[PDB]
């Protein structure tokens, strides 16, 4: 739709502060400017615009972004020189998908650890101390640590720390192939999860909703999550501090790092607008603060608005363990590569598999990607699309046939004329 930005952002965002870019950028353009949130919308995009429609501008995880590249459902995007100054070089290689540039880098994100300072004054620096520090705040009635298990972004950290990987990256390209799901690391990682369970010291069943509501009601000692969540807790009570992820094996976790970013569609009518809105609105200090304020964006792509938050030790601990581990990849496979891990690390945390052979199938499933989960549907919704034609074709055949010669228009008459085989059984 035409005189008009519509904007698709994760609901755990700050979508509300978003809005307000939006109200800023329509009090001076007269274009009116809707955010919304919708659920898998990351799942959704792909679908939606393989017909050309859904939203102008998508806001998400760079590492989609290479998936829908390829589809050629993104547009192209031209900051010049000048503005690609205004961000961080390694956040634009994360929006470069086959040297060509296919999103606006918004904010670096990282998972952190973070703890209740009350019940938890000094937070475990290993994995290894978690267990016997859960037994001792279980006679107090509360519990060390609770995160997502429900989606591998919070468990590969740990998964990761020992050997564990996607895709590797030598001589200037990606190894398709060399997946390492299933390897020495990667096992130790998800069996000490899964003893974890074992001991009940987690449940299996744990959400996001779940770990959430714990830590911020003094429940929990500890958490894993990233910048966007800091706000909920701001609201609660617990005084929490947020620091570098626990060790594994004398090794880091190494979490995936995301670079939230803006790609814009490639059937929309606004494509200078959405530049507009984007460069000159939303990635300035004003507008990123607008964001932020709402929900915490992390270590933004902007330098100079950067250059303050930087100061923030719960930024600090966000880029500390950022560093310790990798930019996610943006290259197509990553959406399987993550329904391979998600089913893994659920399979065996609920007990259905055991650790190595959920990793055996996940590796299995890395051998044998293609196509995307997205790229099948949004293929057969052209088809569903096309199927619609056929009938419709065939209604006005049958209602042009109801209808008297005489009265048929040109149309109608040449449309009828090249059906005669069917015009003769109706
Ligand atoms: O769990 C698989 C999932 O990981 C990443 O998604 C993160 C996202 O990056 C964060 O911004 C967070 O807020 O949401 C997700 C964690 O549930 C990948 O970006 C995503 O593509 C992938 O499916």
Redesign the pocket.
């Known amino acids: 739709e035409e005189g008009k930005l519509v904007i698709w952002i ?1 609901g ?1 965002k700050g979508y509300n502060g978003l809005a307000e870019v939006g109200k800023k950028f329509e009090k001076d353009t007269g274009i009116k400017v809707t955010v919304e949130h919708p659920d898998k919308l ?1 799942e959704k995009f792909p679908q939606v615009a393989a017909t050309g429609d859904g939203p102008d501008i998508i806001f ?2 760079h ?2 972004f290479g998936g829908y590249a390829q589809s050629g459902l993104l547009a192209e995007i031209t900051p010049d020189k000048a503005f690609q100054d205004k961000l961080y070089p390694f956040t634009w290689d994360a929006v470069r998908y086959n040297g060509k540039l296919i999103a606006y880098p918004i904010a670096v ?1 990282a998972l952190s650890l973070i703890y209740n300072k009350d019940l938890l004054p000094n937070p475990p620096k290993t994995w290894e101390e978690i267990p016997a520090l859960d037994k001792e705040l279980k006679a107090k009635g509360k519990s060390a640590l609770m995160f ?1 298990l429900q ?4 468990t590969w950290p740990l998964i990761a720390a020992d050997g564990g990987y996607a895709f590797k990256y030598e001589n200037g390209k990606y190894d398709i192939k060399d997946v390492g799901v299933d390897n020495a690391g990667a096992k130790a990682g998800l069996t000490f999860l899964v003893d974890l369970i074992k001991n009940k010291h987690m449940n299996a069943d744990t959400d996001y909703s779940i770990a959430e509501a714990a830590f911020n009601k003094g429940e929990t000692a500890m958490t894993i999550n ?1 910048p ?1 969540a800091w706000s909920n807790i701001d609201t609660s009570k617990v005084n929490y501090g947020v620091t570098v992820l626990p060790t594994f094996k004398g090794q880091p976790s190494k979490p ?1 790092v ?1 670079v ?1 970013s803006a790609g814009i569609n490639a059937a929309s009518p606004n494509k200078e607008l959405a530049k507009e809105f984007l460069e000159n609105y939303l990635l300035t200090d004003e507008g990123l603060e607008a964001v932020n304020k709402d929900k915490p964006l992390g270590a933004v792509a902007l330098k100079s608005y950067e250059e303050e938050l930087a100061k923030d030790p719960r930024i600090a601990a966000t880029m500390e363990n950022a560093q310790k581990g990798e930019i ?1 990849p943006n290259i197509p496979q ?1 959406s399987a590569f ?1 329904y391979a891990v ?1 089913t893994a690390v659920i399979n065996a945390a609920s007990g259905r598999q055991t650790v190595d052979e959920a990793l055996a199938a996940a590796q299995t499933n890395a051998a044998h990607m293609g196509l995307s989960r997205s790229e099948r549907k949004a293929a057969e919704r052209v088809r569903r699309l096309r199927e619609e034609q056929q009938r419709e074709r065939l209604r006005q055949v049958s209602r042009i046939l109801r209808k008297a010669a005489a009265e048929r228009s040109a149309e109608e008459g040449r449309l009828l004329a090249e059906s005669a085989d069917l015009v003769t059984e109706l």
């Not at 989606?151 to 919070?154: K, L, T």
């Open positions: 994760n755990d990351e998400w995880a590492d989609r994100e997502n989606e591998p972004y919070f990233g966007w995936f995301g939230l996610m990553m993550w998600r």
